[model samples]
Target chain A: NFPTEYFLNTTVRLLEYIRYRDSNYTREERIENLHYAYNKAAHHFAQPRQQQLLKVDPKRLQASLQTIVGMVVYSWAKVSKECMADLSIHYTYTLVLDDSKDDPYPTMVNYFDDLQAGREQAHPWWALVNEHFPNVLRHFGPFCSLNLIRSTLDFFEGCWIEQYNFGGFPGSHDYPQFLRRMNGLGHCVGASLWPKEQFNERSLFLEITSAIAQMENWMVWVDDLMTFYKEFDDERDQISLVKNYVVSDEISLHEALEKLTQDTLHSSKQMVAVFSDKDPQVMDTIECFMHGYVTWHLCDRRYRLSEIYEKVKEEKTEDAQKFCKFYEQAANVGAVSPSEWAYPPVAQLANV
Target chain B: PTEYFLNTTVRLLEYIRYRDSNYTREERIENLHYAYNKAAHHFAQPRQQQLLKVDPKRLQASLQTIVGMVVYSWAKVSKECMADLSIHYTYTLVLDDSKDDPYPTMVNYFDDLQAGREQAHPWWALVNEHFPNVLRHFGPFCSLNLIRSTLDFFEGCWIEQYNFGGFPGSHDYPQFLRRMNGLGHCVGASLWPKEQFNERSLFLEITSAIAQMENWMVWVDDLMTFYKEFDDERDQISLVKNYVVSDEISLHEALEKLTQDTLHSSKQMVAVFSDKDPQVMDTIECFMHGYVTWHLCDRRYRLSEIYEKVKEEKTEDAQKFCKFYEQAANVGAVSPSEWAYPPVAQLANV
Candidate 1:
């Protein structure tokens, strides 16, 4: 039922709009990233967390470290090594925090409560995340870091929202977007791309806003598109985003996947259009991430996409300069886009 | 009347302690007395025409409540910023009670302030005179946060006026409007300056602080003011009222859910900031505790009714409402009202 041709066409068009490049990166670079995370993370924990580390299941640790490190390598290809380790360690903790489900382990639920009561956290994941996040925050400017923290809270809240849905589903038209906004980590993913050193966040805020909104759509849906097959028969991955679409659109699963592919095609173009006139460096960084993100999903073992890996590699890059002609012909969708991305400043707290 | 109010006052204090247990007893008493003593400065200001219109008793009641509220929550502010905040909120009390829909003036009179031109409205005159001084205490980064948040609050009031006339039905719009209009960011942004949270590293912590303030700002007043507000609907959108209409929930369910939400956010605020510098945690502690206590003791919430003796002459099953100056002098957060509990006779009549 998967529209394999439609899927391939949309993503290739997306990469071309981003001026996608073949990576200079290879298996060696991937191994190097793994070593950097493994040795450093273990060493950092060696002294304070030996007892705690003993408790972490070796298998979960392996997967958490590997997948998260790959994520950092893809999106943060441009960041410093220290920045890479910080991102890797933190994301791993978020993964291992999966120790919560089916009544959500108290350690996860009471992550803050444990902090407040003046005691050791039962879970090492909480302890590690709490310890490392401050330094991770230091890498970004105020709004960048603000969105990161805000998004982290959104993820935490999303955990509860899914749990609440166990009670029942709302089936509202907006429910999909609402849950996705909370669970998607869109702002976190978006804001993390613009560390303070690479971008002058304060001066380039308008551009950052455009990039963040674009990245949210690109990352959340692109992953969803790539994983459609992996998740097709998967019961563990129930309540997936496409399942959300099936309910919201009242369409079959196959139709839902096609609509997503169509939207993904539009989203990638939107990213290019919004950033086309901005500074070269900002656009260049975004293009790298958009391409790299797709590359990781295609090549990574998690999605089991070996069949299309060569297809993705063989995908042609069009005349790089000619998209400007395409841009002039087809960029009106974003011109008057007063930006549905807007958030209100504050509410009528009390003056009314 | 006494027992009902007695129960009301007790439940509010318990909520205060629950959400903000980090507030030490010593800190609460110190800030309580500090605001009480400093609030006299509010009345000392030259009265405006609005003041000429407001009654003496109403003036006495609202002024002390508003000023004390500001001072207790913002105890760390410099004296000048303190003066400006006091002036700002005193005017807020005036506007809140009188009500408005200036439409154009709401947008532009402050627009004049932004352009550094003279005020068109006399009340914008009031804000222009002191609000700039408050803004100066902030770096442009924080100052702009303050201004933007305040603008949304006015926009909130504007739409509230429209809703005051009458309308949205969605999960998203209500929250989006509430976030913008709530003016919680002012509290969030105000707590930090370049001085305390000086590094860019502190920005994430600042965002959570703002989040906490947003929660603290919008939610606490509803819990504390529910007793007085339950009647007349206030004919308004309160937390419970807002949620009850937007979601399919009962009045009591909404109340419980709001309480749970506040408690949850409050815990997370401490989780985020508790590891920061001691002063940062301390300031949040004071702001949260002092903020809630103001609702408890303030005359506006009418928590004082249990102690109100109407007049020298008894009428219709009870005495008429009046209070002793001596009682007002000693009133603080712990007391229910500005009246002595055992009458002055407990001092053995001197």
Candidate 2:
């Protein structure tokens, strides 16, 4: 288990960091803004009956706060409330886009068409970004490179369509590519953190950002492992890298875990070598990224799979015991060392 | 790029019959075809032509040269036949570029096609304009499978872009390359007889063989584009970019490895086709030769600049790979006296 104080302090620091630059948007106010965006999206994208079918609950928005926090902690820029609110809303939009719950929203493809046309009229997210978070837009525009952001969104949508096309979990050969697509969330946010001073050396800056993306893959791999049971329980179609590895590679659960452990460490070490010499600031961010993501996953109820295991044990959940066992075996492997799970020794960052 | 065949078609009263609400069928096809040709020209133009106001030399090759010639060489198909097939190949390019292509473009063609909308389907217009006999030959339903395969290519390209800037491991590069190129679509759409594979079992078997050929030809495009000056304005995804960015090997070594892999696969490719006519294997060899020869001789490809550099350095092994394929095709053995910017006999291959 992680130290409660560490999670608390990091969460507070990130929360305060974003809140410090506030110009009147409080936590409640942000949630209210998200409700407006949600309704607008549904109204613009869905049929009249579909618009009224699912309730827009602002509380569910907390599910993605950890993701926003991860982006904030990993970002090189100083966080502002507007940027935080923008990212939070963006996360909510994507979650609804990836809507796995039995919600009566229009398909993501339709929602995307609505978003694409949003700029043409008074779109909600457009207003959210343009009016409320213009600073966030400016920060992303000049730094992130519009092409990269566009590609990232295309990739996100493409992965959705690809999974639909393939009709099941992606084959093991295609699993890494799927993770990389999902990791576009980090690519846009993390690549934007490219040091402004290093822009002249475009190649080197790209190299460093690429390394950061590699670190994100490890974080995603670990997330897939932790949420294996939760995803298995979900009603919608899903794919787990660990599950795909076992079937496609014909490996045991333990073997898949061990291999993932090695790959994660290899990526983390490679990142250190890539950035340590030229930019330790970048190196520190990568470290914070892995650490921050792990902290978020472990403490956040939204991603906790162990609870599903407990539920299966108590309620004798039908047909879930097998996945619970697999999750337990994988969790045991992860418990061997924090290093095995892509985290540096906690002692090394004593003050942080 | 602005004056598309479809744009002129849409304005014609004859083509207006295809229009619907949202200018559905006709407008989307016009947009899709426009986007397709736009991307093809973007990649096909010489770097120098892209920067200058005028392409004085006419060195910027056509879409048929960069892509269609490849399909033509492998199958020994007719120019019209090859052009018919090349539309799907170039459509994949357009769909992949949709994210970058500006609005008023059919960037959503992939979505509409997958959803099985009439508006974005390429088959109806393809039959009407280019290959009227296609339906008679392959049945109307085969185009659905063909479109599905093209979407597979579309998805693979997205996966490639998803991993953009981040270099995939060298060990995993070939798998990604195979998928990204979607050789199955190329083979199923071109080389293999669509009419011959009505049986599901036969269709599956031929798909595996086509995939092998595609893997063999993956390096063809990689090396063809390698020496081009990296310009974001004209750059589409290239395997060379992944290797160069990976920093695991120098760009020269990357090209050298690709050449070596092509040679190794050329022999195995023949074995995969051993059950078929020997000439089919020969045609496959022609593709290998045609690709390298085009890279060597085509002014638009920019790889010729590296050929000179490699020859000057006496590191001619990579160049030797090209010559090896050319000789294998009975073309590269000609005397040095015949050499010129556009060699005298090279047009015969085209």
Candidate 3:
């Protein structure tokens, strides 16, 4: 009753082929870009302190860079290579600071202050941000407003509340709100694309971009749910929607799944309503992103969900019910010792 | 009627102390318990030992005076909501005062979280436990956004404190003070508990209005108090001080500009909420009246005790602004037939 090897091979290869054709960079170029971003990040953050040990690991930085570039490619088509390079540098700075170790200057706030102070008092990361960020805004041309830039920075760096994980549940509203803020996908994606339509088309553009921003919460939750097992490994302090739900004691695993499904369905419909009958190119950009994101998740070893795909292929119809049971059991098992997970440290909180 | 107004003020105070009798008292005891025991506590170190003995009662009064009047004016709030907000107000007050204090209250709260050493600070622990509960009480969206705005206010305070001993430019001072004074915190606290307002956008409009008024009035309080009571060298970190010290403006001129700023902002505040809930505007007037009356009459603050000395030396320039705000408050509250400045002045006994 098992599926033939040929069928399984074709299914995996078809998706892989689509991903390859859609990639903005060749594998060799992708590797080179990752190293370039990492070296720039290390020079900016680690060189000044002469603390060689403080340098960011390229593997982790590359992983984060890939996610960022993957999302960006699907959202905008006319993005320049120079702009992408700038974005990679900025993302590298963010990731490096987030993973920095025991030191006096821990928060982005600390780095921000020094950056504001200029070269005399600045850290290495500030130097990199100063170099790349001006170019990013310049590349966006007249579409960028001082107001939009300020608001984007204000929202992106708003991490003070993230360290406030202790003492209270923060209620249900905060979880989704926090998740949405964490990504900064709205500003990140919206900032890159300029509107070419007439003045009257502004509302549609606003609605479409806002809808895209709204979809980030659903996207993040799905990622969290799929990667639930990874949190239990070495990254024991990671807080996601599922982790928060279990600790809150407000909903069971089954109940949480039901809520997520409802939200996903609602979100997908909203995206469809916004994208349908619009510019075909704009619609294609979004569709490719959605498909590419799923393909990446399925194949990425980081998520550890490939076994589930195998199980589904083998059991077919019978596996559907069992998949639900597996998730339910996983949730219950994970909830058994909630405190074993460390309280999320404060440094990692961004404004979102 | 004057007696009734006085009774209103007294009753407000009593309600504050009485609200959430068990939880409030328990929290206070725990707080005071720590102050008495902890080495180099904020109260004990500052104002020497006198403020320490008076800290508990004084802390409760200070909290009740501002937020108490603000929230009570909104009309209907549960006892639990009031208690929770009161605790948060107390936290904010302590944090505001702790900026210059030797105890490092703000640092301790933030640093412990940075280090994941929450066990070291009870204030941090209480906030972690109660902040979310307060958010939930306000519903999710309102509470979440409110908390976000309030966090901005707190971060603004930290930035201000960090930039102390240096003057921010004149144009930037208003914006800076608007943030540093926790107007966002005050507005968030005042509006969140009153969830009856359904239009989210309109609620923000009213909130922004209240924030603008609170911003200027709080700055006015700083200017008047700094001139009358604070030492230039010791308590040099006020908005007015920044201007006075940097621009070399006379105290009278500074007071004049701030008074005008306060009046303009208060008028704007009255305009926004007058249609939504005229009583909210009236309560704001009450706050203006209460604040000025407290400064003119109550000796709990050094400004009141030294008011006469300043008026004599600085002339009526300061009193002119005080009388104007005092009159402004009465214009809205009492009927036209009942509106009498002399009697209102006598009521406050200024």
Best by TM-score: 2
TM-score of each: 0.47, 0.48, 0.41
Q: Candidate order by TM-score, highest to lowest?
A: 2, 1, 3
DockQ of model 2 vs. true complex? 0.07
Predicted model with the maximum DockQ = 2
Q: Is the docking of candidate 2 incorrect, acceptable, medium or high quality?
A: incorrect
Considering only chain A, what is the TM-score of each predicted structure?
Answer: 0.77, 0.54, 0.60
Q: How far is B340's C-alpha from truth in model 1 (Å)? A: 24
For residues A104-174, write the lDDT of model 1, one tens digit per residue.
33444334324334355555544455456666777777556656665665565456446544211222233
State which candidate has the highest lDDT. 1
Segments in model 3 whose C-alpha atoms lie over 4 Å from true places: A1-55, A66-78, A101-127, A141-176, A179-186, A193-209, A232-235, A318-352, B1-350
| Docking quality class, candidate 3 | incorrect
Candidate order (lDDT): 1, 3, 2
Residue runs of model 2 more than 4 Å from their true location after superposition: A1-77, A100-136, A143-148, A155-159, A162-172, A175-186, A194-216, A225-238, A246-255, A305-352, B1-54, B58-64, B67-220, B223-350
lDDT for A29 in candidate 2 is 38
Candidate 1 deviant stretches above 4 angstroms: A23-34, A42-56, A102-125, A163-170, A308-352, B1-350
Name the TM-score of candidate 1. 0.47
Weakest ten-residue segment in model 1 chain A by summed lDDT: A341-350
Q: Quick one: ranking by DockQ, best first?
A: 2, 1, 3
